[model samples]
Target: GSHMSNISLIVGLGNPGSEYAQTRHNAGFWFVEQLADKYGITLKNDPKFHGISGRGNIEGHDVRLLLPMTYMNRSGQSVVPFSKFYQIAPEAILIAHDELDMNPGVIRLKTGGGHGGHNGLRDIVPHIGPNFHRLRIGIGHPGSKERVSGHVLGKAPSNEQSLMDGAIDHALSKVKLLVQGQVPQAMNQINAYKPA
Candidate 1:
């Protein structure tokens, strides 16, 4: 089979507005913004992609940065169209999303893994299939399943806030690694990293 297109599509999943800005569920969006800031790239509203988008070179490879506005559960509505329009294969896409199963400072990277009951990932996989890469940002599960919704939509505790910030910064630095096709190296650096 021919190799997939070399273009990399980095998508940050989240809802819109100040209402969801600092919520745990929007961690992916936060990381993407930090990465864009580091590279001095500004997002322009792109109705076609259902969100804002910016084009730039990361580690010398052309990249399209996307922040879907379809909200969390319906994220694939935008992601599918964006990938199809760009001719980007699922394998060439990296989705950054929040993960309640992990601790605040932890991150996990995986290729073609199960969605772990995340509505965002569950929605995305059916549209893009399960072959894409994922960067799971730890958000820490709630004490009870009944609180799951509130947990993700709520801000982290004051002490945990710093930990989340550190994780975002770490994720921001890994953008270059992803562009260089060194996902494994980047994953190791971010996943195994311990904050002091």
Candidate 2:
């Protein structure tokens, strides 16, 4: 049995503004937005945290969500205040960001790891350390280094976007399990849902 009890804050890493709103890097934002909608949590910009923050009751737990207003590299600045103000431990914080290593529509959960060259984590690790949990949402690489920037910063094709939506939908189905501190079950369920 897992004794894990709470998830204090779930932070979504993405660049601010409408320009990047539809980009691959903003998939984290999309995830939180959908979760908020489903759970009746209203996300709004918070000057104190420097991000769009929200809170809701899920399965008897009060959970917080944050979508940083900082650029891809300054996500720490937006998250630091929330974690400190709430006295949230690193282990209870989950950082969700776009992943380039997997195919579209894939998201993996991990306790901690190296940044994997993620621009957001590069800035985040220094502030919060790499001990926090991570939600790696796949965006699929551009297949070449030179096109990497355009791929992440640009919008995904309709087909690819559909796949990401499918993955998010599957992940959403496991949120209750996550709130119950059964993260392993949540991860197992979400990870097992591979689209053919």
Candidate 3:
């Protein structure tokens, strides 16, 4: 409702540089860029923090977006200081990361959950604890366990790229709801969406 506190931070997990761009593991980056554009906000690189950070207001709630530059496994390095400097509680942070267990066209959010074997989350949970909200963008897993790493790091086939974009767009539509702390409502709407 209107009484909920403003969301303070939105962290997007990904490795650095263009080599990782457009890869499944960079889904978080994709979402962050999309969200920043939607709000007409500019994201500038922060040398001290080793990531890109932006400021804007979503639904009147002041919000900041961060895209970590550390390797996926060390994502916590960026998140810790970013959160600490702003005095943002874990509850006010929404982390967007790629998820392998779900299909490419799906996206989901939750207040707290295990990292679910994601190296990005693996690094983040310890620094911020597990209370932060998450925007789990589905990237789907490789059929063979051995292929999982390659699958996430490589570019997606055209068909799957479309699906992943759909998921990101869906999640993008929930920015205001999320910033307002209406997580349950945002989750219901995004979860119920059926990708074509």
What would the TM-scores of all predictions be?
0.94, 0.94, 0.94
What value does the lDDT take at residue 120 in candidate 3? Answer: 90
lDDT per residue (tens digit) for residues 81-156 in model 2: 6787888878778777889998887888878888887888888788878888787889998888898789999999
7-110, model 1: which lDDT tens digit per residue?
28888999999999999999889888888888777888989878888887677777888998888888888888888987888878888999888898888777
By TM-score, the best candidate is 3
Q: What is the lDDT of residue 145 in candidate 3?
A: 84
Worst 10 residues of 2 by lDDT: 1-10
* Error in Å for residue 83 of model 3: 0.3
> In model 2, which runs have C-alpha deviations exceeding 4 angstroms?
1-5
Which candidate's lDDT is highest?
3
Against the unseen true structure, what C-alpha lDDT does each candidate score?
Answer: 0.82, 0.83, 0.85
Candidate 3: tens digits of C-alpha lDDT, residues 69-95: 888998888988888887888888889
With candidate 2 superimposed using the best TM-score fit, by how many Å does residue 133's alpha carbon deviate from the native? 1.6
- Alpha-carbon shift of residue 29 in model 3 (angstroms): 0.4
